[PDB]
Amino acid sequence: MLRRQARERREYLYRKAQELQDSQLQQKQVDDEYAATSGIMDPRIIVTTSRDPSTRLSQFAKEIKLLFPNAVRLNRGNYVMPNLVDACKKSGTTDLVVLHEHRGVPTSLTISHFPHGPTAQFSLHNVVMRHDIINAGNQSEVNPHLIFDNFTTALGKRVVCILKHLFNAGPKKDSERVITFANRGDFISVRQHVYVRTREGVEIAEVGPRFEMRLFELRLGTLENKDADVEWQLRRFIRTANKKDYL
Amino acid sequence: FDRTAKPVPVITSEVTESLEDMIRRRIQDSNFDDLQRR
C-alpha cells in the first residue's frame, strides 16, 4: 500500500514537470490534478481546525462549511496529521480545509487537494463572521454562482482553479446565491451575496462572512508532506515586497 | 521610515461601494465564472 503512494508521487511530480515544460514551450486547460475529475464528480470537502480549537474558530469552521455545499466538519481532537490525511483519502475526500486562529481570531487557512496535492496556504485578515451579525438568519445552501476578479498571471489562474473546484458543477441559471473572490493587490476579498433581479437593475444582499485572503505558500503535495516540493512561495524580505503583485 | 510589507487594506465605504457596483454589473450581464458540467 505504501509502495503505491510512493510510485504515484513520482508519477505526479513527473506529470507536473512535463506540464510545466509544455506551458513554457507554449509561452515561448484545467490543471492535471483536477482535470481527471473536472466536471465529472462533485467535490467532497472536509473542514477541520487545529488542536484544541477555541469556540470562535469552531464557529468560523462551521461557517466555512455553509460557504461550500459539500463540506463536512471533523473535530481535530488529538488526530495525528499523517493519520488525518490517510483517513480522509480513505473516505474519498477530495479537499481538506484546516483553520488557524489566535485568541479566537482566525489567522490562517490552508487547502489541500487529494490524493497527491496540491496544497495552498492562506493568511486571514479582517475576518468578519456571521455570528457577529444579530438577527441575521439562516443561509441558503443552493449551488452558488462564482465570480473571480483580477486573476491575470499564470499564478492567478492557478489559484482560481484551486478555489474553483471546491464547489459543485451546474448551478441553476436562476441560482439565487453568488460567491465572489476579488483579487486586489494579492488580497483576495471573499464575500457571499443573495440578490433579486429587479425591473431596472439588480439588488444584492450581503450574507457574509468578510475575509481577505492572500496566498503565501503553494506546494506539490499533501499538506502533511512537509517534504513536498514548493510550487511557489511568498517572499516577504524582498525590497520590492513593498510593491510587488502576483495575482 | 520605510516599511517592509504592504499596508493591509482597509475596507472603507467607497471600497465597498465600488465593489458591489461591479457585482451588480456582473449579474446584470449574467457574467459568472462558474464551473459547468463537462
Partner: peptide, 27 residues
C-alpha cells in the same frame, strides 16, 4: 442599500473601522 447591509440585522460594535479611517482622510 443601507438596510440589508449589517456589516456597514445589525452587527455587534467594533466590526467596522470606517469611523477611524475617515478621520484621517480629514487629517
Amino acid at each position: 442599500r443601507e438596510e440589508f447591509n449589517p456589516f456597514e440585522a445589525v452587527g455587534k460594535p467594533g466590526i467596522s473601522k470606517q469611523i477611524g479611517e475617515e478621520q484621517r482622510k480629514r487629517a
